[PDB]
Amino acid sequence: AVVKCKPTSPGRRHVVKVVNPELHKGKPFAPLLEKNSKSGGRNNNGRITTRHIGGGHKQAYRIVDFKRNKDGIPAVVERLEYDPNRSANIALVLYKDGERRYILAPKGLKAGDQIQSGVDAAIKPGNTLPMRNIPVGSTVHNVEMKPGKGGQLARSAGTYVQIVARDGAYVTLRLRSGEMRKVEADCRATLGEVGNAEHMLRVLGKAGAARWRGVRPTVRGTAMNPVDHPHGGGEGRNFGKHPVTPWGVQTKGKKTRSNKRTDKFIVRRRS
RNA sequence: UAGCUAGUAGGUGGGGUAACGGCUCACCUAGGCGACGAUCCCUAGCUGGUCUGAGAGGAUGACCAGCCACACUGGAACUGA
RNA sequence: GCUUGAGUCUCGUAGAGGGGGGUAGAAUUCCAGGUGUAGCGGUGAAAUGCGUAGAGAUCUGGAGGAAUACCGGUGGCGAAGGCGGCCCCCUGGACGAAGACUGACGCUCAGGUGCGAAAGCGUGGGGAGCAAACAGGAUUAGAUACCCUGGUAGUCCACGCCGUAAACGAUGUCGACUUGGAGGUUGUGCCCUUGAGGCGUGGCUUCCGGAGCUAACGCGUUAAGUCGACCGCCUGGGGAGUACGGCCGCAAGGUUAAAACUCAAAUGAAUUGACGGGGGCCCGCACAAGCGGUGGAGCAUGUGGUUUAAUUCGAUGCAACGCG
RNA sequence: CGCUUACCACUUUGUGAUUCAUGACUGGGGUGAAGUCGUAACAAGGUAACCGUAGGGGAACCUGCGGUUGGAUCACCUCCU
RNA sequence: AGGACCGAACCGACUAAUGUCGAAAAAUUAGCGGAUGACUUGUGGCUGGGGGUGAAAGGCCAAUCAAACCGGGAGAUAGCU
RNA sequence: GCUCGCCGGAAGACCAAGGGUUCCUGUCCAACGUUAAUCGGGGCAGGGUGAGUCGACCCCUAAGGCGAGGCCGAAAGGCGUAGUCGAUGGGAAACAGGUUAAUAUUCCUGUACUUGGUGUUACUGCGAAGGGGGGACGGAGAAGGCUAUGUUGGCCGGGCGACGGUUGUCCCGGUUUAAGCGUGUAGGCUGGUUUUCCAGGCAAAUCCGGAAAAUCAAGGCUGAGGCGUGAUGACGAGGCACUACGGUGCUGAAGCAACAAAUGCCCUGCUUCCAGGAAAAGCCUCUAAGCAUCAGGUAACAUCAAAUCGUACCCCAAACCGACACAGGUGGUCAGGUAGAGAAUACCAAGGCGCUUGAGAGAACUCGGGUGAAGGAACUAGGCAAAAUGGUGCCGUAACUUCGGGAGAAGGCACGCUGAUAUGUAGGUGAGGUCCCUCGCGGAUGGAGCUGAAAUCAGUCGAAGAUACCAGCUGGCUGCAACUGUUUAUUAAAAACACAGCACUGUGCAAACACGAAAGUGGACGUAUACGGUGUGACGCCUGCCCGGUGCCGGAAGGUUAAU
RNA sequence: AAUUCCUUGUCGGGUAAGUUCCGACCUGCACGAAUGGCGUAAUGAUGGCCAGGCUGUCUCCACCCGAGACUCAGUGAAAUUGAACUCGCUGUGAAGAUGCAGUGUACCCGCGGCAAGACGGAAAGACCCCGUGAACCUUUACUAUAGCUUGACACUGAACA
RNA sequence: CUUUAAUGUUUGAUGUUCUAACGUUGACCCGUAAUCCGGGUUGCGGACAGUGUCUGGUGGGUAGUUUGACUGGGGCGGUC
RNA sequence: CGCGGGGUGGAGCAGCCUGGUAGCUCGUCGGGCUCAUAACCCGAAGGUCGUCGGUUCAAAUCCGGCCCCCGCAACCA
RNA sequence: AGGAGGUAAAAAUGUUCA
RNA sequence: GCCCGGAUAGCUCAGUCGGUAGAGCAGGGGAUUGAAAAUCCCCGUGUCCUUGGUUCGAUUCCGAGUCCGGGCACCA
Ligand SMILES: *C(=O)[C@H](Cc1ccccc1)NC(=O)[C@H](CCSC)NC=O
């Protein structure tokens, strides 16, 4: 629902609201609610390790089941929700044994669906099962690298991964960035792309709109003095230096990929 | 040039004119005109006739004559049939 | 009142007519695994690019998006644009048959409304191949062209907008009449189906031509023939389908639509010629197959150029230059 | 008669519309015996043309998409009774 | 609905005068801007000296900041007064 | 003591904070107060702070801190698990009146409530650092129902009046009443009830959750205010009475109704949008390891206990922070009358003050203001400053445009008072009566009373009817920046910064990057529609040529090439 | 032009008069397309210009009401200063004389005012220079170093091609 | 000597496989009601990764410093 | 400083590992080429092959030593 | 008779009138 | 003013062993064609700013007067 506003006031004219009429309007489910402390971007020492973080709206963390290890138990999707600290909608599922859980909402979804996690479920949106049972070529999400880690990749709006090939006990995935990383074949994956994919079409419109998301203003480099930023200085607007980070490392073209304990898993790299 | 008008469309009563009438006031009705062209803008005295043209028309309206209008510009009124 | 107008009902037929949803096969591109080795790819030739990290080629499997081989036909349908692998649902139009019914409800139509190829545009997805812009190699007097290796938007789908084409049989629509032949296409009637059939009756459509018309070319029962009904539009060319304004459009612009000026032609058909890196037949020491020369050396002779008091004048593509 | 009320022309104030000249300067166009670059169209104009549309380029023009004919030409050579 | 409008509280600090051994080591008076938000404010915590924080002025970090304050090197050094 | 003037959404009356006896009385006047001083926040002595219900302590928890073991680091020390602290948060219980020189929801009178210990009686299964429910919550907006409170009338009491009138539609004062208990309303929330079963809730579970049948239609919960009661009580204007003449004692009528109405309460509601809105304990309930003639629990009753600290005074200021008895700053609550949209403003009430140097004079000059003939920016760096416009309703309103605006454009008309329309209309509220009923705080009908716009007409006064305080200057051209916003605290508020938006680039999770010798954290309990860095800075049309230099990405065969 | 040295360039409008303003001409000292270019409705305690209204801003000030200034009583400072019996003038002079020379002039002492001087007071000039002073800042200045990165050895082994 | 073919041999490396070192911010159990940690099963990587010592390169991110004198003031030019 | 590499008509660049050939193109003269211009296609000028010495039948080449350039590690009077 | 595979690179320019 | 670049035919401009001066167009003629164009040839096109010296010879190599442009002309 790409609802574009009308220019009634300055700053309002560019606000495009993505509304979801099927989302539950009521309060969240208390049993799965746990507080989520805002950090401001400070660590143990208290220093600001990451800039541009602060303020924003208070929000509560809704524990999400990523593991999907309730082996062989049908469950119906009670309702669709809104999760602040995430780009994707979350669904409240109810199992046959009478237990409620939060799973990420896939694309082909609707309140009244029935899913089930395990190595027997049908190749259909929402079902979870190991990757060595799925047809090679199927599109999944919420996959992992460790057999039971919980689910790492493809965890945002409209995000999916395509199981490209099966080599031995490893599965090649064409990632969102355009990678091709082999992951352990026994890692779980939830079929179907993640819904709420119109998160991209949204435009905040105001400077304050970002301020309640928690994005404090980013000060440009060439606006400071020489002591603050390796760009700084200048009489009146002149750069004359090579674009670097606040800490000398040259940005715009410096592949800092350095782990080497994982280059054995990357078949094809981002291009 | 696509809508225009508000004493403006009509009725009633008084008044007014040599005479009828919104000609003019008061009240009531909300109508009246309009694509077979209203309002607006530009232009222009009209006609008998004149010139031309085989005819039909086209252009035109000076000299003679009929009529309307004007008399430095605009407004009002009297005298008097 | 009636009926030869027109409209409606009953049964069926043909059809890429239209919308929505699944599905299928071949091929292309990409990716993974096995096999396997120096080329692959391309052109007028070459190169860029791809490759010994192991391509291309080959086999297996998967992934997607787009377009539907043969059927296929100057075949069919639709108002036109335009529409074709298969299947279901929803639905529009036309046509034939033996009858009936209503009884002119008809036709046309400024304004107005809708649809309206492609390209393009906004919002959102998708994105194989192909491919504006762009990059590189060539070609080249120059190549911001044609050729070739890649390539963003786009081309496709949903909802709006745009409203324009050589949107063209350059032919408005409706109705009537006006010699025929040769095919295709779709109903239908009768006779012996006595065999790939024979003879009539309607719709659509292709080709050729008679009358007649037309400037000619040609149209020619789907007419540009003979008539009637109503509408749009045209009044020399360029200016210009341009300006100003209005109206519509997010934008690109569209639409309605001049004047001054300048020229006195512009234009169409057709014919005699010429020409064409158009075609066909034919011919030549033209080529082809050869022999000997030329151009390289010295020299004779003529011309141009230079020079000179004059170095007479002419001739000066082939067709001047041992010529006068 | 004077005073006074309604009516009322010249005129003033503010805010629109329309139109005539003028206006530095500028875009495009018409026009002009022998200037510059290239050669786009006319034959198959040497990449067929043209129309519609977008982008591109010192200039005509170029490329992509769709459409039309107001495009020419169909002979020579390998297979089969 | 609104980083919407006018406008008190509240917050801020554009103009002018006053004040400048002041009432005050940046205030007063008369006018100003924001005033449902990127708003303001109370209480309690957290980040620290070549470090913190900074809608970025080299501004702020206890009336002190192009590197705070306190103590110690240390009676630094001074070709200068 | 009598007049006078000022504040009155404060200059009033109270808490937190923070001070620390400044509070009250007697007395003293050197020093302190910018003057005098029998005066005082000054000196001296004495007096004063009374709590089961207020707050803190207490129980629990946030940000965050410390941190047994543990990990890491030359040492110091850093981080952090179990735990243990930490309110500005959550959790039991009281109100009215009187009294002091000074204290009081703290003492006294009266009337109540809450949480535990122990004991008695009758029943019944109780029982965790464990589970579930609850606690438990966002912004904005509108309405309805009420109350604080105010006004008016009736009623009671006093007056009838030093200059004209005033026994009457007259004047002044009063007309006060809480917590608790009972009813359970306006309104809101949720469909109740029984049975069987179950891969769920680290174990178990009758509790919560889930799946099918059955039964009836409502039950249950929450809930301001009102009405009774509290209360034939207190209070209460005014008198009766003694004065150290400051005040004490005694007594004490009326004490209702109507209307208006909050930012207070219902509201920890309802509608809606999105940026999606603490935690734990108290409390309720079910069981595990267990304990069952027990122990405990439920209900009623009796008795006992409710400890310790603060409590005085100031709290928009001479008592706090500013060196001062300083024109500055300081969070929260209540906040009346008339006019008014209003917590603006003006004048007043309650209440509190006249700011701790005054008396004369009436020069220049200065500061703060008023008015000004004629002209109206000629002043001047510049219309700086003053002046002016200033409100509500109606009419009317351009270029341009992102079609919202521009715009309150501009510019005009009417505004008071009286009467009439109408012995105050429309409207709002609304008693009695009548009827019915699943009978209560009910619903229709009904209309007295009360309150009360605005519009039109007529009349009238003045120079002026938005008459005061209050309260836009408008228009045109154009540069720059989109806008709200932020900044040099204390000479620069801007075109600077930010900004949503656009783009390139880095990053595949043990992520990049950052703090940190390290561990570990932040990034993020996020994972490419995500995060970091950089540049530009809405929106519209676009963004051209160049790879030598430098940086970067990639291919490395050859040359050079460290340690070894 | 927030950019044009020459320059107040040239032309047109505006004014009686216009180094500014506004629209253009290109001679761009030395604009230029994300250190973004050119437009742009609205917004602006923003920059420049114009007109109306309006006034003491001004022509040229006049008057008046209050708080000071003044007088009396009480309390009672401050910056500063070598010592003073502390005049003008011309000249001299470490080069601008209250103090020297010459000369004129001038009874001693207060109060209210005004500011030309006492190179008046305040701040051991911040301008300029010096110091083989300091401090931060920059970089393809020198020498180092955190970090990132390369190779050898150790933690670190077994096998066949 | 230039150029080359098989083999033996001396070393640098590469390919692949394995599990025992090691890593493990994978799952499970226990210490324990505790996402730290430690240990034990087990899975996945695997002699890599990562760390130490020596060493080359880059390195204004950070630190310590130099950056002449004469001079009709100083800078510039010139000079020594 | 010592392992590398490179010097060619007036400029630009092959012949360098293999000794015998001084060329391929831009620019200038000419010849054609066409009817003519231009364009392509050709044959010559013009290089002490950096200088000196020297193995061989014969030198740009393989060889020597030294002047002149540009890239590295270097260099503590 | 009936239908398919194969089929040439470069060539710009020529002033006014008759 | 000084550091620097030039004055050349009618006009605009070439030119560094130190060697008696050249280009195009303008003007005229000729070839030119039918008349023109286009193109070539011919000719006049001269104190080489002015003023000096050495020299076989001076525009040239250097000094000084004139004329025309770009820059030292920096801070306080
Ligand atoms: C030169 O301009 C210096 C710089 C300066 C300005 C202001 C204060 C201090 C220094 N001007 C002065 O030194 C002035 C004199 C100006 S005369 C040209 N001195 C002030 O005290």
Using CA atoms, how far apart are residues A119 and A134, in angstroms rounded to an integer? 9
Among A61, A96, A113, the domain boundary falls at A113
Structural contact between residues A140 and A192, judged by C-beta atoms closer than 8 angstroms: yes
Q: Are residues A154 and A63 in the same domain?
A: no
Q: Are residues A176 and A207 in the same domain?
A: no
Using CA atoms, how far apart are residues A157 and A115, in angstroms rounded to an integer? 20
Residue nearest to nucleotide F134 (CA to C1'): A30
Question: Could you give the C-alpha distances from A246 to A70, A119, A258, in angstroms and in order?
Answer: 47, 50, 20
Distance in Å from C209's C1' to A196's CA comes to 73
| DSSP H or E stretch at residue A79 | strand A74-80
Structural contact between residues A239 and A214, judged by C-beta atoms closer than 8 angstroms: no
Using CA atoms, how far apart are residues A199 and A148, in angstroms rounded to an integer? 29
**Between vectors from CA A34 to CA A94 and to CA A113, what angle results, nearest 5°?**
20
Q: Are residues A107 and A159 in the same domain?
A: no
**Between vectors from CA A105 to CA A22 and to CA A114, what angle results, nearest 5°?**
90
Q: Are residues A22 and A40 in the same domain?
A: yes
Other CB atoms within a 10 A radius of the CB of residue A96 amount to 12
Distance in Å from I66's C1' to A155's CA comes to 75
Nearest to A103 by CA among A72, A130, A80, A129: A80
Using CA atoms, how far apart are residues A91 and A192, in angstroms rounded to an integer? 14
Q: Are residues A127 and A172 in the same domain?
A: yes
Give resolution in angstroms.
Answer: 3.3
CATH code of the domain covering residue A250: 4.10.950.10
Name the closest nucleotide to A232, judged by C1' and CA. Answer: E56
DSSP letter string, A102-152: EEE-BSS--TT-EEEBSTT--SSTT-EEETTSS-TT-EEESB-SSTTS---
CB-proximal positions of chain C, under 7 Å: 31-33, 61-64, 123-126
- Cα of A98 from ligand 1 centre, angstroms: 89
Q: Are residues A65 and A21 in the same domain?
A: yes
Using CA atoms, how far apart are residues A72 and A130, in angstroms rounded to an integer? 13
- Cα of A236 from ligand 1 centre, angstroms: 27
Among A71, A92, A113, the domain boundary falls at A113
Q: Which two tokens stand for residue A43?
A: 């660590």
Distance in Å from I42's C1' to A173's CA comes to 66
Q: Are residues A215 and A173 in the same domain?
A: no
Residues 6+ apart with CB under 8 A from A219: none
Q: How many domains does chain A have?
A: 3
Q: Please measure the distance between the N-terminal and C-terminal CA atoms of chain A and give it in whole angstroms.
A: 33
| DSSP H or E stretch at residue A183 | strand A180-184
Nearest to A78 by CA among A120, A112, A31, A119: A112
A7 touches strand E (CB under 7 A): no
Q: Are residues A180 and A219 in the same domain?
A: no
Nearest to A183 by CA among A193, A192, A174: A174
Q: Are residues A97 and A180 in the same domain?
A: no
Name the closest nucleotide to A238, judged by C1' and CA. Answer: G35
A 167-226, residues with C-beta < 7 Å of strand E: 206-209, 211-212, 216-217, 219-220, 223-226
Domain range for A33:
1-113
Gaps in chain A after residue (C–N beyond 2.5 Å): none
Query: Can you give the length of chain A in residues?
Result: 271
Among A85, A113, A141, the domain boundary falls at A113
CATH code of the domain covering residue A7: 2.40.50.140
